[PDB]
Amino acid sequence: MIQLKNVGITLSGKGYERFSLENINLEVNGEKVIILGPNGSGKTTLLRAISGLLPYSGNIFINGMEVRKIRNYIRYSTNLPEAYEIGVTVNDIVYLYEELKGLDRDLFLEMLKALKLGEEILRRKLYKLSAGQSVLVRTSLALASQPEIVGLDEPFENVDAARRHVISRYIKEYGKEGILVTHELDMLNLYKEYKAYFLVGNRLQGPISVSELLESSIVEGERNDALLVLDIMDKKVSIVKGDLGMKFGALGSLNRIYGII
Known part of the structure; x- marks a missing residue:
């Protein structure tokens, strides 16, 4: 169970002139949900707060x-870079996580091998890895402890198509409950059985089935049989089943939600 109860977090600025997320409410149990939001919406900041890495x-x-009462919980994992020491070797991190989270070295090595990331990657310092390599290693570290609950930030960004498919298989198999955050819409077709929320309108809005989203259309206004109605600035944007408008599947970018209106 993850419960966010009236969470607020500052995204930019300070004091009287800041921009923040406010009144964020969510309960997740027994499943992974996906939070979809444009770059800059505060998705990663939300995961950092849940992971004990930022005040809120x-x-x-x-x-x-x-979360203020948690220094470490062995059953929770995150792939956030803040959880890992960029400076030491991957192998060094593996040793820490074996104790900190009960990471299984053999399972971790199995993931690296499936990802066609070489045996030598262990000997490499984490900071020195490419963006795609870094996220694959960090996601693999998060999952190889067989967490009950996981917070995954952008696990597919800078990752080539083949390795996206490999890591998705592990994401689906390990960590039954948790939150995956992403701005990338091209990955949703692998997550049809999952529920999604949108971070827009200074709110977390949903849930909606990804299966239904992927075959939906998005239109301005509040429509009657809508799968989900989003409140944005002042307007309403409806996600509707079948052909009332442009296909959500063809959207390309979440920022286009603002544009269609």
């Missing part, structure tokens, strides 16, 4: 433990 207003509970 309101309360976040993981299995009834408020």
